[PDB]
Design an enzyme around this catalytic site. Structure first.
Site, PDB file in Angstrom:
ATOM      1  N   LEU A  17      43.660  42.376  40.741  1.00  0.00           N
ATOM      2  CA  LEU A  17      43.132  42.355  39.382  1.00  0.00           C
ATOM      3  C   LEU A  17      42.031  43.426  39.257  1.00  0.00           C
ATOM      4  O   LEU A  17      42.106  44.278  38.376  1.00  0.00           O
ATOM      5  CB  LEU A  17      42.633  40.946  39.031  1.00  0.00           C
ATOM      6  N   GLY A  18      41.082  43.442  40.181  1.00  0.00           N
ATOM      7  CA  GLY A  18      40.015  44.437  40.171  1.00  0.00           C
ATOM      8  C   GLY A  18      39.251  44.524  41.475  1.00  0.00           C
ATOM      9  O   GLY A  18      39.721  44.064  42.516  1.00  0.00           O
ATOM     10  N   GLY A  19      38.078  45.130  41.421  1.00  0.00           N
ATOM     11  CA  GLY A  19      37.235  45.283  42.597  1.00  0.00           C
ATOM     12  C   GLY A  19      36.058  46.210  42.378  1.00  0.00           C
ATOM     13  O   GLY A  19      35.835  46.695  41.265  1.00  0.00           O
ATOM     14  N   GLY A  20      35.309  46.459  43.445  1.00  0.00           N
ATOM     15  CA  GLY A  20      34.147  47.333  43.398  1.00  0.00           C
ATOM     16  C   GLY A  20      33.346  47.255  44.676  1.00  0.00           C
ATOM     17  O   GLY A  20      33.915  47.039  45.749  1.00  0.00           O
ATOM     18  N   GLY A  23      33.446  43.218  46.258  1.00  0.00           N
ATOM     19  CA  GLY A  23      34.774  42.907  46.780  1.00  0.00           C
ATOM     20  C   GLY A  23      35.932  42.975  45.811  1.00  0.00           C
ATOM     21  O   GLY A  23      35.739  42.947  44.591  1.00  0.00           O
ATOM     22  N   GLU A  24      37.161  43.033  46.374  1.00  0.00           N
ATOM     23  CA  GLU A  24      38.403  43.072  45.601  1.00  0.00           C
ATOM     24  C   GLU A  24      38.783  41.665  45.112  1.00  0.00           C
ATOM     25  O   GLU A  24      38.509  40.691  45.794  1.00  0.00           O
ATOM     26  CB  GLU A  24      39.539  43.657  46.455  1.00  0.00           C
ATOM     27  N   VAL A  25      39.394  41.558  43.932  1.00  0.00           N
ATOM     28  CA  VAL A  25      39.819  40.270  43.385  1.00  0.00           C
ATOM     29  C   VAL A  25      41.334  40.304  43.213  1.00  0.00           C
ATOM     30  O   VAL A  25      41.871  41.299  42.744  1.00  0.00           O
ATOM     31  CB  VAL A  25      39.093  39.935  42.064  1.00  0.00           C
ATOM     32  N   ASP A 131      23.091  35.736  33.373  1.00  0.00           N
ATOM     33  CA  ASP A 131      23.928  36.897  33.079  1.00  0.00           C
ATOM     34  C   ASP A 131      25.027  36.555  32.057  1.00  0.00           C
ATOM     35  O   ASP A 131      26.171  36.968  32.209  1.00  0.00           O
ATOM     36  CB  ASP A 131      24.519  37.487  34.376  1.00  0.00           C
TER      37      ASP A 131
HETATM   38  C1  W9D Z   1      35.084  37.590  39.961  1.00  0.00           C
HETATM   39  C2  W9D Z   1      34.719  36.615  38.855  1.00  0.00           C
HETATM   40  C3  W9D Z   1      34.357  37.329  37.559  1.00  0.00           C
HETATM   41  O1  W9D Z   1      33.531  35.861  39.297  1.00  0.00           O
HETATM   42  C4  W9D Z   1      33.775  34.510  39.286  1.00  0.00           C
HETATM   43  O2  W9D Z   1      32.885  33.709  39.455  1.00  0.00           O
HETATM   44  C5  W9D Z   1      35.182  34.299  38.901  1.00  0.00           C
HETATM   45  C6  W9D Z   1      35.934  33.136  38.749  1.00  0.00           C
HETATM   46  C7  W9D Z   1      37.256  33.226  38.340  1.00  0.00           C
HETATM   47  C8  W9D Z   1      37.835  34.473  38.097  1.00  0.00           C
HETATM   48  N1  W9D Z   1      39.177  34.514  37.682  1.00  0.00           N
HETATM   49  C9  W9D Z   1      39.917  35.438  36.993  1.00  0.00           C
HETATM   50  N2  W9D Z   1      41.205  35.105  36.837  1.00  0.00           N
HETATM   51  C10 W9D Z   1      41.968  36.026  36.254  1.00  0.00           C
HETATM   52  C11 W9D Z   1      41.502  37.243  35.766  1.00  0.00           C
HETATM   53  C12 W9D Z   1      42.442  38.148  35.093  1.00  0.00           C
HETATM   54  N3  W9D Z   1      43.650  37.908  34.709  1.00  0.00           N
HETATM   55  N4  W9D Z   1      44.075  39.052  34.036  1.00  0.00           N
HETATM   56  C13 W9D Z   1      43.056  39.934  34.066  1.00  0.00           C
HETATM   57  O3  W9D Z   1      42.009  39.393  34.738  1.00  0.00           O
HETATM   58  C14 W9D Z   1      40.102  37.481  35.938  1.00  0.00           C
HETATM   59  N5  W9D Z   1      39.504  38.588  35.450  1.00  0.00           N
HETATM   60  C15 W9D Z   1      38.112  38.966  35.635  1.00  0.00           C
HETATM   61  C16 W9D Z   1      37.627  39.665  34.367  1.00  0.00           C
HETATM   62  O4  W9D Z   1      38.373  40.858  34.131  1.00  0.00           O
HETATM   63  C17 W9D Z   1      37.894  39.860  36.840  1.00  0.00           C
HETATM   64  C18 W9D Z   1      36.620  40.301  37.172  1.00  0.00           C
HETATM   65  C19 W9D Z   1      36.430  41.189  38.219  1.00  0.00           C
HETATM   66  C20 W9D Z   1      37.509  41.639  38.954  1.00  0.00           C
HETATM   67  C21 W9D Z   1      38.775  41.198  38.644  1.00  0.00           C
HETATM   68  C22 W9D Z   1      38.968  40.314  37.598  1.00  0.00           C
HETATM   69  N6  W9D Z   1      39.337  36.571  36.576  1.00  0.00           N
HETATM   70  C23 W9D Z   1      37.081  35.632  38.270  1.00  0.00           C
HETATM   71  C24 W9D Z   1      35.753  35.530  38.663  1.00  0.00           C
END
Ligand code: W9D
Ligand code: W9D
Lengths: 288, 283
Positions: A17-20, A23-25, A131
């Site tokens: 989904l993302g990172g930086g 860490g990576e998600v 935040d």
């Molecule tokens: C890491 C973070 C914010 O911290 C927490 O406490 C937490 C809890 C649940 C989380 N779950 C989650 N599930 C699905 C998506 C998604 N599904 N499609 C696009 O994104 C998503 N996106 C966020 C916003 O773009 C995101 C943020 C940063 C990197 C990647 C994605 N986040 C995410 C988070």
């Protein structure tokens, strides 16, 4: 509590989904139940002072509320800390309004009610989010609203506990020094102000002063005559929304209302506020 | 940092003056001059020595004022940092009032003037003492008063009180003015206010909305100038609290008759409380 097993045993990784820097998600599916979860993989092995990661997971495990992102567990395998959390399909409100554009007054009132419910819970547990912004408000596929990313509150909590609270006698400390030693110089009502800025961010796609340099914004807010911001267009919004912004953005923290007091405001107490308002927003996101 | 030699080459250690988390402090005599010094031996702990040793000692050396305790040099021998500083014979004001008892208003007024002079210098150099109290005000054998013992986020969504802490740090040099006011009460009553209350309970009381600044317990015992000095230094609001140079114009510290003689009289009570010989026959 932490599982010292490989996360790939319990979940199937689907996509990044993302990172930086931290860490990576990843998006992932449970092998037994089939339910989706997000996994935040943090590189944790030679890193000094992991009290930030420790306090973030502690905040998450103890938080049990519908409007706070659910926490499932943590793994330590091959010097990487995978934090398993609730999957929120539509991403953050920021990811959504960057495509759909400005939210409607009713869609903003539903989001404000859901964030206020999450803040009243956090504040009752003596926690501060610190935040609140569109990027930290996640939306799932059912249109439900979740407060997320306690990373800032974890960095503050770890600093104001051991790294900056190994000091003896308070008897000679001035009251402003005592406030910084105990709390950090502010209280949970800073989240109420941030919610008010977030409501403007959802209406106008930017928080106020977003074009001004961040260093110049710190100076303006600290200047004696700082006037709280307001909605740019007056006619576009009802008197209830203008009053919600006015009260959430009270300059004085002593006069600013609490999260439970804000739940009785007309904008947030009106009928017709439900996840359907956000499913209508996600239809605009899915269809060009 | 300055000398990478053993301190026992230049000084003879006489006795351990004290210690704690802040290392071990010893009384010592210079081999060439014979003058006494105080050596604070700090156990290094391997972590950093680029700024933690060179820049810290550079600040210590560049603090040059009559009311700040004098710095002589530093040594690094066998992973121990010995800081050579002025030997202040009478010790701290706390060590003194624990024997002599309550100080007089003129002696407190003198100490306040000397601490204010040291604070106005530190504040002009953009430094904060942050720990003004009787235990950190040293008196030398000449009756001189020396001060001793020295962003997370983006701002667009931050409340104004959060912005103030991020930019200006939560507090300024005026915290030293409040601490001086508490120290003035400490020298008069032998304790700071609320000293009997648990330290955790004191942090909560001061942070509570209705916190009232403390006052002198006996009213008649002190003049209106001393009561006003306490009132003014203990202003709850840091924006309204006067600076160190503004406090030097206050009636209490600007009055005539304030001189080193008042402190010399305090060291005489410390030296002569013991009884004379009665049973010693000898010849
Ligand atoms: C890491 C973070 C914010 O911290 C927490 O406490 C937490 C809890 C649940 C989380 N779950 C989650 N599930 C699905 C998506 C998604 N599904 N499609 C696009 O994104 C998503 N996106 C966020 C916003 O773009 C995101 C943020 C940063 C990197 C990647 C994605 N986040 C995410 C988070
Ligand atoms: C370490 C400290 C405070 O930090 C600095 O910056 C400094 C500068 C000069 C210092 N010089 C000094 N010289 C003589 C005496 C003395 N002479 N008779 C009794 O004590 C003394 N006593 C203090 C107060 O009891 C002390 C405090 C803690 C342990 C041992 C002694 N301190 C001491 C210090």
């Amino acid at each position: 509590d932490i599982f010292n097993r490989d996360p790939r045993d319990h979940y199937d990784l689907l996509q990044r989904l993302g990172g930086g820097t931290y860490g990576e998600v990843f998006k992932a599916r449970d092998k037994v139940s089939g339910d989706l979860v997000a996994l935040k993989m943090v590189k944790m092995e030679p890193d000094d002072d992991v009290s930030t990661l420790q306090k973030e997971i502690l905040i998450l495990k103890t938080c049990r509320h519908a409007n706070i992102v659910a926490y499932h567990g943590s793994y330590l395998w091959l010097q990487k800390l995978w934090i398993c959390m609730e999957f929120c399909g539509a991403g953050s409100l920021q990811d959504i309004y960057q495509v759909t554009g400005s939210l409607s007054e009713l869609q903003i009132s539903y989001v404000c009610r859901e964030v206020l419910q999450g803040l009243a819970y956090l504040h009752s547990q003596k926690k501060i989010h610190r935040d609140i912004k569109g990027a930290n408000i996640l939306i799932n596929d059912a249109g439900e609203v979740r407060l997320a990313d306690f990373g800032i509150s974890a960095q503050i909590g770890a600093t104001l506990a051991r790294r900056l609270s190994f000091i003896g006698t308070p008897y000679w400390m001035a009251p402003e020094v005592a406030a910084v030693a105990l709390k950090g110089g502010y209280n949970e009502l800073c989240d109420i102000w941030s919610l008010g800025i977030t409501a403007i961010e959802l209406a106008e796609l930017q928080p106020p002063l977003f074009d001004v340099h961040p260093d110049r914004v710190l100076e303006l807010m600290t200047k004696s005559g700082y006037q709280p911001p307001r909605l740019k267009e007056k006619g576009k919004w009802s008197a209830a929304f203008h009053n919600f912004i006015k009260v959430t953005l009270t300059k004085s923290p002593k006069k600013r209302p609490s999260a439970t007091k804000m739940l009785s405001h007309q904008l947030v107490s009106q009928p017709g506020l439900n996840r359907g308002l956000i499913l209508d927003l996600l239809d605009k996101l899915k269809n060009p």
